[PDB]
Write a protein that binds this DNA or RNA. Structure first.
Lengths: 177, 115, 210, 69
RNA sequence: CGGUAGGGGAGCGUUCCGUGUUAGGGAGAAACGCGUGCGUGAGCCGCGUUGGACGAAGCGGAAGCGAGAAUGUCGGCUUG
RNA sequence: GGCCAGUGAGACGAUGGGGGAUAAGCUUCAUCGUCGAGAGGGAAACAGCCCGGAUCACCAGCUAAGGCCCCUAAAUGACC
RNA sequence: AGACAACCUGGCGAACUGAAACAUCUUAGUAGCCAGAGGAAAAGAAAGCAAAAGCGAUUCCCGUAGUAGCGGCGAGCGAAAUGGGAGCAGCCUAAACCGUGAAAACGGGGUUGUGGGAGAGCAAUACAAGCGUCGUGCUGCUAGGCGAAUCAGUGGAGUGCGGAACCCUAGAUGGUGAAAGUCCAGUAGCCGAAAGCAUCACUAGCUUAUGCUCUGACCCGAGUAGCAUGGGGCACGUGGAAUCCCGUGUGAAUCAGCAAGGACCACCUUGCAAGGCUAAAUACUCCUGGGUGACCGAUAGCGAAGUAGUACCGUGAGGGAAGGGUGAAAAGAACCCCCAUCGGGGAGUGAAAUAGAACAUGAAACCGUAAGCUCUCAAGCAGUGGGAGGGGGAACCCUGACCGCGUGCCUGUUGAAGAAUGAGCCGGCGACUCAUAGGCAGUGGCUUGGUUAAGGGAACCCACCGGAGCCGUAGCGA
């Protein structure tokens, strides 16, 4: 493969059309911008989502729901379905499982919020071989599937939240059964 | 990264040469050499299709006179009653051509038509 | 693929050292290796091409004469692009091109280049060098007795590149020594006369599989 | 090296629905409803998908939002 | 198989770079012309001169890249 | 459906109408034609009427609208 | 005490603009002006961030995130913590009590934080660091030197070409009549300094701090934090508006305290103010040295390839041009003739001077000259198809008698040959470009995943490294 001999495949590259060089090119003169008007004039031009004085669609419509204050956050716990977990990459059944094992396996990868996710096991999907999961709270349907499977499952307590002593004492007082 | 040109001089010498014997500024003065060029090509079209049309005309009138030479009222009209009734495959107004070269032949044609 | 005999200083045929390298699918080789070259030497360039716009040129910003009441065009500065005093429209200013080419593709441009140069009388191959008092005569004579000398650009490389061959390889313009650290797509892409050593034949084989 | 800002005045409006198509919210609901029949009122509450014209006024005006078609 | 606005397809050309201190070149590089040579065409081959030094082709790359229209603009020249 | 345009005051002719004075090469709408964006022949000249639709070559022929005394092709042809 | 290209800090601080108007907002705290200082400045060692888990002075790049949020919730503005890197560096003071005192003041102890410092005891503390005295020795900078290898024939000249040798730790460059490793200055490598200056090291001085423990309850940066009130900036437009600095007036406690943890209140967690200093990574160019150029090469590149901020213009601030290329060597023209010594023709030089000094290729417009054919009853956007007559080298090209057809070109219009626009002609200069991002298509790589960014890499490109981060994997819901 000498330097001279090498060539690129066909259709790999398209020469950019240069507007205004000639009439034969066809973009010459007006350049397809037509005659006059705001679009024809050089400049930033009319703003997008602008209706030329009519109320824009965004303006007429009320902002969705609960707009002002809202967590507007979904993800809490990364969710990996059983079909995805049992199927595809398959655990030895000797292996521990959990988030650390999963990342290594490559079935599930958490990058933006590794810290925020605790993981969850979805009810959906069926697992052929029983396995032990040290992951935190799972869906009841999903929890049921593992139990039917008979694979050992263990809930994991991720963290403890500090509470005021007076409040804590109050809870103890309730302990009326 | 200046990229200046000379391809105009050839672009334009070529025309400058196609417009020779144009008798005015139409042969020297480039910015009009161009539009002249355009207009010579255009009249080449119109004079070409009109030359087909024009030579028919010329032969119709020429054959027409040769036929009217018979002193009785014949025509280029009636000569063609009688030249298609008798099957002659279209001497193609080029009987108008021998009519001036071999006139005796065209009198032979004409007599066979009259029969 | 195809094997190839090892040479020596004397120039005989010890050894086998079969070389196998991963290659692009046929009909995709040119696009794969061409694009790799063109990112190579497109990336290499350097901007170093500047100019001045209507705003930097030193000409002033005085409206040279009033708008109307004069019979003459509406010229609006003598620093304007139209006037031949300066002010270029859309001149070149230092742009910094760079073409991220996917590693696993770039590799494959090498493997294709190499794997295409071998087996057609374009890969002689050695095993070592012992030069002392580096002298560019024993070395060029080595090329002579060795493979193809003819000073016809004969890319040529080695492993760990002992100084006393670096130091006698530079005088000869046609062939330039290479190391894995210094490997480039360009110069191993003559497929003309490129040599190897066993450290390169297995190091090479090791880097690329099938 | 710069980035395209998202017209926040229409990200507080739209939304996109997993299968990837803009929805919105219907208009005329928190104002003067003695007048308005019930029937109309529960027609003026359902979040409906949005028509195509503006579906092209916005997909350009709100670029980081993962809409298909 | 008419075609303006306009959209799509296929190309030529110019300065520069890779293949190069390339092939070729003081028996002579480019501007002017004879060849209706050659092309649908942008243009290409040849052909010559007092001077006369550089530089193709092919496969590729980049663009201060293609002009008679801006009462454009710089220079030289006319008309009256 | 995707990616993207240009267009946003048309003109006349035919018809049914409003306004006008059943005036305008006026204005305003509805249904079609040509021009716009379309050449060519008839109309003396003559976008918007008639035939008609131009890929090219032809010093070949038949016709359409229209025409046959001269300028310009073709009967100063028949009979009422 | 003056000067400064740009970068920096401070004070004052606009507007055209965007919002298709415009007063809140945005351009923007930008521009500019003033005031300092540095080769860098500013910032900086925690009354910080966090969040039941951890960090640990500052300053930058990546990235989180064009997300959270703010916003006539309009135009728009837009963080940060965790994560990854570049660079790392910590100290000195104010009390408390002691030794002075013409009652100010100086000396010594004292400086840290789940709390230190004022108080109580040794077996004769050393290693460690900084600095300085002048002093010593290499390393580089400011001169420089040695430094390999050939000739012939070609043609005005050879470095090219054909032939024949050689060097190469030196085919990097500049020249030399025409291009060369072997012609020259050179280059690799190598040697070199009075003296001056650099970045370090060492020989001898000051200086290093928590070697430890325990029970008291002194001080722990006073008109300062708070508050009221007026603001400014915080990504955050007076909003529940925290922290952060300011104008007016009131005006705490200090450790069985005080501030922060986005009003506020409790409990818990972090840090402990109102004193100061400090290198690097970092932004910059009027510049200097080294190198590189898909940068220009004479209306381009600096405005400026010669007395270029020049001539010139303006009172003044200020504006601001154009002019390059005989030859390899002036060998730049001895002598003669026309001759007011302007300019010429010979002669001479040179390869060439129709290269001769308003000299290098020399286009077009425009000004002539000579030859070929042709116009004086003409009518025409001046051409075209037919071609009479004639001239050319002996079927092609020149000119054209006469006929027919043909209402300039662009912009722009429902509609222009238009008596609508524009252009005197010629030659040049002159217009959808780049940066980063979203979307789509073509092409390719990979895939039961794809990719790395900042950053390194014996320069710059770069093989290899770098998994932080992003995209595809689960939706519905405020």
């Amino acid at each position: 493969f000498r330097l001279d001999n090498l060539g690129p495949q066909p259709g790999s590259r398209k020469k950019g059309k240069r507007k205004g060089r000639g009439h034969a090119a066809g973009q010459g003169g007006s350049c397809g911008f037509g005659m006059r008007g705001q679009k024809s004039r050089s400049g930033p031009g009319i703003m997008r989502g602008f209706e030329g004085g009519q109320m824009p669609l965004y303006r007429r419509i009320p902002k969705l729901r609960g707009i002002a204050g809202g967590m507007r956050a979904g993800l809490p716990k990364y969710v990996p379905i059983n079909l995805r977990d049992i199927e595809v990459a398959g655990f030895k059944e000797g292996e521990e499982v959990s988030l650390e094992s999963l990342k290594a396996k490559g079935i599930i990868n958490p990058s933006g919020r590794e810290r925020r996710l605790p993981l969850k096991i979805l009810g959906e999907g069926e697992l052929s071989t029983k396995l032990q999961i040290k992951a935190r709270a799972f869906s009841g349907s999903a929890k049921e599937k593992l139990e039917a499977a008979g694979c050992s499952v263990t809930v994991l307590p991720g963290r403890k939240k500090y509470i005021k002593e007076s409040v804590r004492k109050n809870l103890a007082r309730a302990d009326e059964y | 990264r200046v990229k200046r040109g000379y391809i105009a001089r050839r672009r334009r010498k070529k025309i400058r040469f196609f417009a020779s014997s144009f008798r005015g500024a139409h042969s020297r003065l480039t910015r009009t050499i161009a539009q002249q060029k355009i207009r010579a090509l255009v009249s080449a079209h119109r004079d070409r299709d009109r030359q087909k049309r024009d030579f028919r005309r010329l032969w119709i009138t020429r054959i027409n006179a040769a036929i009217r030479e018979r002193g009785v009222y014949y025509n280029y009209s009636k000569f063609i009653h009688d030249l298609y009734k008798r099957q002659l495959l279209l001497n193609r107004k080029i009987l108008a051509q021998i009519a001036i070269l071999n006139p005796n032949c065209i009198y032979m044609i004409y007599n066979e038509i009259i029969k | 693929l195809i094997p190839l005999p090892i040479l020596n200083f004397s120039g005989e045929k010890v050894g086998e050292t079969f070389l196998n390298l991963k290659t692009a699918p046929p009909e995709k080789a040119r696009a794969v290796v061409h694009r790799g070259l063109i990112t190579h030497l497109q990336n290499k360039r350097r901007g170093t091409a500047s100019t001045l716009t209507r705003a930097e040129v030193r000409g002033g910003g005085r409206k040279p004469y009033p708008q109307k009441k004069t019979g003459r065009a509406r010229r609006g500065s003598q620093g304007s692009p139209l006037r031949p005093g300066g002010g270029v429209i859309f001149g070149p200013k230092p742009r910094d091109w760079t073409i991220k080419m996917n590693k696993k593709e770039r590799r494959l441009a090498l493997s294709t280049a190499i794997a295409s140069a071998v087996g057609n009388s374009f890969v002689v191959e050695e095993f070592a060098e012992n030069f002392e008092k580096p002298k560019t005569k024993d070395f060029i004579a080595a090329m002579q007795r060795w493979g193809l000398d003819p000073a016809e650009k004969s890319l040529f490389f080695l492993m760990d590149l002992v100084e006393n061959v670096e130091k006698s390889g530079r005088n000869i313009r046609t062939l330039k020594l290479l190391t894995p650290r210094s490997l480039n797509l360009f110069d191993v892409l003559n497929a003309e006369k490129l040599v190897f050593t066993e450290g390169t034949i297995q190091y090479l084989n090791q880097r690329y599989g099938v | 090296g710069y980035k395209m800002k998202t017209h926040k005045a229409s990200a507080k409006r739209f939304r996109v629905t997993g299968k990837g198509k803009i929805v919105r919210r219907r208009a005329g609901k928190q104002h003067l409803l003695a007048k308005k029949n019930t029937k109309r009122k529960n027609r003026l509450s359902k979040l409906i998908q949005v028509d195509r014209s503006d579906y092209d006024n916005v997909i350009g005006a709100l670029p980081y939002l993962k809409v298909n078609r």
